[PDB]
Design a protein around this ligand. Structure first.
Ligand SMILES: [Cl-]
Ligand SMILES: [Cl-]
Ligand SMILES: [Cl-]
Ligand SMILES: [Cl-]
Length: 145
């Protein structure tokens, strides 16, 4: 069962999360999931502010900014626990954008793609997860169909 599907099935995802915790990748996966949540929230909350011209937008904007900043500080920030590592200029670009511009849903998308790539084919994530007992156990929930 492939990573594309693992990440989006909450039964199967648990096994992968466990594996990542054990191998100390958990950070990447969390980052990814947070970004996935974040984007959708931004789209929901900012598409409301278009059809809300016919009124506390500030509340929304500040929340999204906070969320963005939180994501940065937890995961991409230099001074950060595990800290997902990717093309340093992408992170720097993101930081620049944050430091003088209202955030969009997509600010994270470039970094998120790289992180997904890492999770897919870095020998220490998915490819050795599929070589682990946890994978086998997960595929034990064919019994959940
Ligand atoms: Cl489990
Ligand atoms: Cl968390
Ligand atoms: Cl910042
Ligand atoms: Cl972008």
């Amino acid at each position: 069962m492939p990573l594309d599907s693992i990440l989006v099935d909450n039964v199967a995802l648990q096994f992968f999360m466990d594996y990542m915790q054990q191998t100390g990748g958990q950070a990447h996966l969390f980052f990814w999931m947070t970004v996935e949540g974040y984007r959708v929230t931004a789209q929901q909350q900012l598409e409301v502010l278009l059809s809300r011209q016919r009124h506390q937008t500030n509340q929304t904007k500040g929340l999204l900014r906070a969320a963005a900043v939180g994501i940065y500080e937890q995961y991409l920030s230099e001074k950060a626990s595990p800290r997902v590592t990717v093309d340093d200029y992408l992170v720097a670009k993101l930081a620049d954008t944050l430091n003088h511009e209202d955030p969009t849903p997509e600010i994270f998308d470039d970094i998120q793609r790289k992180v997904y790539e890492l999770m897919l084919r870095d020998e220490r994530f998915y490819p050795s997860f599929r070589q682990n007992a946890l994978y086998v156990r997960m595929l034990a929930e064919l019994e959940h169909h």
